[PDB]
């Protein structure tokens, strides 16, 4: 449940937001 319904509100942050969501995320 904590890994079956919490993988949606976290997998949409890497869609492609100015490609800047991979500089402060990692």
Summarize the SSE layout with pairings.
Blueprint: no helix or strand
Protein architecture, described:
Belongs to the beta-catenin family. This is Catenin beta-1. It contains no helices and no strands. The chain is low in regular secondary structure and 26 residues long. It has one domain. The chain is elongated, with a radius of gyration of 10 Å. The relative contact order is 0.16.
Q: Key features?
A:
26 residues; little secondary structure
Write down the Rg. 10 Å
How would a crystallographer describe the biggest sheet?
A: none
The first-to-last residue Cα distance is 24 Å
Shape: elongated
Overall structural domain count: 1
Strand runs, count: 0
Structural class: little secondary structure
**Number of helices in the DSSP assignment:** 0
Strand content: under 5%
Modified residues (Phosphoserine): 5, 11, 15, 19
Glycosylation sites: 5
Subcellular location: Cytoplasm; Nucleus; Cytoplasm, Cytoskeleton; Cell junction, Adherens junction
Family: Belongs to the beta-catenin family.
């Amino acid at each position: 449940k904590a890994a079956v319904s919490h993988w949606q509100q976290q997998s949409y942050l890497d869609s492609g937001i100015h490609s800047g969501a991979t500089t402060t995320a990692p």
